[PDB]
Structures are given as C-alpha cells and as structure tokens.
Design a protein around this ligand. Structure first.
Ligand SMILES: CCCCCCCC/C=C\CCCCCCCC(=O)O[C@@H](COC(=O)CCCCCCCCCCCCCCC)COP(=O)([O-])OCC[N+](C)(C)C
Ligand SMILES: O=C(c1ccc(Cl)c([N+](=O)[O-])c1)N1CCN(c2ccccc2F)CC1
Length: 298
C-alpha cells in the first residue's frame, strides 16, 4: 500500500517553494536525503521513508543528517507509545457536539496555494465549561486524530486538487476575547499541542495568521522580531480588528467563511461551522484510493 498511495497524488512541490522541498533539491540536499534514507533503512525501518517525510525532518534540522535521524527515531518511538498508528480507529471524540463551542477548532477548504485552512478561536476558549465534560488528555487525542486525518486524507486530496504536492496547512488563530487569565488557563494545552506539532509533525505549518491581536502584543512583536528564525517569521502574520483584506489575499472569498469576511457558508442544521469539515477531502473529484476521511462524531 505504501508505494501506490503516493503515486495516487502529485508529489512535486511548486518550484517557487523553499529549498529542500520535494522536486527542488540541489545536489547536496539529494545526497543528504539518500544518506539519511539508507541510515534509517539499515536501522530496520520500513514505512514513512518517502521523499516528503524525510525532507521535512531534514529541513527541520537544516539538513543535518544525524539530528534528523535522531528526531525521526524519537518520533517513531512516540508513535508506538501513544498509539498513533491506529488512533483513527481507536479514539472516538463523542463529546465534540457538546464542547466544540467552548474551543472552536475546525478545518475549512483551502488557501490560494492549495493548503487546508485550519481555524482555532483561541480567544473564545472556556476551559471551565470544557472541563465539565472532557479532559486535556482527550483534547490532545482529538488533536492527534485530526493531524492523522490531515496526513492520510486531507493532504492527498488537496494535492490532487491543487495539481501539486501539498504538505502544509494555513492556520488562522482568532485571539478575540483573550485575556492574561485565559492565557494562563490555556497555557498547558497550548504547550503540549506545540510540542506534538514541532517534534512529531515537523514542517507541517505553512502559514500562521493571528487575528484580533491586542494592540500591545503586535507592537511588541515587531520589535521582538529578530529573535525568531527568519523563515518562521515569514510564515507568521499579526493582525488586529481589520484582518479581512489580508485574509482574502491568501484565501479565495468563496473558501473563506462569512464571519471572517468571505462568502463561504455552512448550514446550521448539521451544527454549523464548529462541527463541519468541508474541503476537497470530501469531494468525489479528489478522494483517492485511501477512501473518504472518517467523520469525527456521529
Ligand atoms: C528586543 C526588545 C523587544 C521588547 C520590547 C517590547 C515593548 C513592549 C511595549 C508595549 C506593550 C504593552 C504591554 C501590554 C500588552 C498586553 C497584551 C497581552 O498581554 O495580550 C493578552 C494576552 O494574549 C496573549 O497571550 C497574546 C498572544 C496569544 C497567543 C499567541 C499564539 C498562541 C498559540 C501559538 C503557540 C505556538 C504555535 C506553534 C507551535 C508549534 C491580554 O490582553 P489584554 O490585557 O486584554 O490587552 C490589553 C489591550 N491593549 C494591549 C491594547 C492595551
Ligand atoms: O504545526 C502545525 C501542524 C502540525 C501538524 C499538522 Cl498535520 C498540521 N497540518 O494541519 O498540516 C499543522 N500547526 C502550527 C501549530 N498550531 C497550533 C499549535 C498550538 C496551539 C494551537 C495551534 F493552532 C497548529 C498547526
């Protein structure tokens, strides 16, 4: 199944993409990739040795082969202990219709480069109400579940729809309603989620828009700017109460939801935006041999 699944969708990043992305390797990047491939092979590894996976790890370690082998090995260790390799069957987030309003997290269509768009309304989160029903451990299970649906279903379909490899998502994080107090209360979840993201899903973040940022924090960020990695800085966007134009630059109006200033609508019979999962991975044109992605609840 390994070799056919990847033949089922375009595997080249567009050429104007960052160096070391599939299809765009120079000689040395190619040598390093072959080298790390063989080094993992000899260690007795089989699956997930494709070009995309390994160039993500390498980009994450600036193509240092040894540290990339390291990070890969730790990631597989975590996959075994956590049960990731089967979570899509094992875990069932039956509470979602109940607690979605208390931490809106949802995927919706694609940006102009073909990336699935991911939305988190962090500033509206109410862990008081969420903790009446579920736990942080289960929230993180759902997050990994969603990441696995991204990798196994959302990205292959997005790649077919865009005509080229799609490896990343475009995140929109709404800060409207945030406070120091609610920051402390979400701190533990956000830090766990980040750890998972950076270490077991490297280079999956393509854009990261913060919107309704408080005036203070964005001024601060412009001064603090040199302290971050320049690539990371170019993927980040701080915006205030008027973000609609800058979002509509990156996401077609019929893809971006109305409440953020586009034209895309969801009908509230199914439970509206917070419970939806609309995009090319639900489109018969783009669903491939992997089948359609599972729904999160029934
Ligand atoms: C080199 C020298 C440079 C330094 C000098 C700098 C000079 C500084 C000068 C002036 C500044 C004035 C200070 C007051 C600012 C208060 C704002 C504030 O605290 O924000 C809020 C907290 O909100 C947050 O927590 C903000 C960030 C949200 C989370 C970011 C992403 C998290 C998820 C991603 C994680 C990783 C994802 C990826 C992981 C893989 C509190 O809101 P508030 O109190 O109601 O705001 C007041 C309103 N006002 C600000 C307009 C008045
Ligand atoms: O690195 C990521 C990330 C990680 C895995 C996957 Cl599968 C994807 N993806 O959809 O292609 C993105 N993200 C940046 C961090 N983001 C995040 C981290 C912590 C809290 C909230 C957040 F939105 C989530 C998205």
């Amino acid at each position: 199944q390994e070799k056919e699944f990847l033949e089922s969708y375009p595997q080249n990043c567009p050429p104007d993409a960052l160096p070391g992305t599939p299809g765009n390797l120079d000689s040395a990047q190619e040598k390093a990739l072959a080298e790390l491939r063989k080094l993992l092979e000899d260690a007795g590894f089989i699956e997930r040795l494709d070009d995309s996976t390994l160039l993500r790890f390498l980009r994450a370690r600036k193509f240092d082969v040894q540290l990339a082998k390291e990070m890969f090995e730790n990631c597989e260790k975590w996959r075994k202990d956590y049960g990731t390799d089967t979570i899509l069957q094992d875990f069932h987030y039956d509470e979602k219709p109940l607690i979605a309003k208390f931490y809106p997290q949802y995927y919706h269509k694609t940006d102009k480069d073909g990336r699935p768009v991911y939305f988190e309304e962090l500033g509206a989160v109410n862990l008081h109400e969420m903790n009446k029903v579920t736990s942080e451990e289960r929230m993180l299970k759902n997050l990994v579940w969603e990441y696995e649906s991204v990798v196994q279903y959302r990205l292959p379909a997005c790649s077919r729809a865009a005509g080229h490899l799609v490896e990343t998502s475009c995140t929109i994080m709404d800060l409207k309603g945030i406070s120091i107090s609610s920051a402390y209360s979400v701190m533990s979840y956000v830090r766990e989620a980040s750890y998972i993201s950076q270490n077991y899903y490297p280079e999956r973040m393509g854009k990261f828009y913060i919107i309704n940022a408080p005036f203070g924090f964005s001024t601060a960020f412009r001064l603090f700017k040199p302290f971050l990695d320049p690539v990371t800085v170019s993927k980040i966007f701080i915006l205030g109460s008027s973000y609609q134009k800058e979002l509509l630059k990156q996401i077609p109006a019929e893809n971006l939801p109305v409440k953020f200033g586009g034209k895309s609508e969801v009908d509230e019979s199914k439970g509206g935006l917070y419970l939806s999962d609309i995009g090319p991975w639900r489109d018969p044109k783009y669903i491939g041999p992997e089948g359609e992605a599972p729904e999160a609840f029934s």
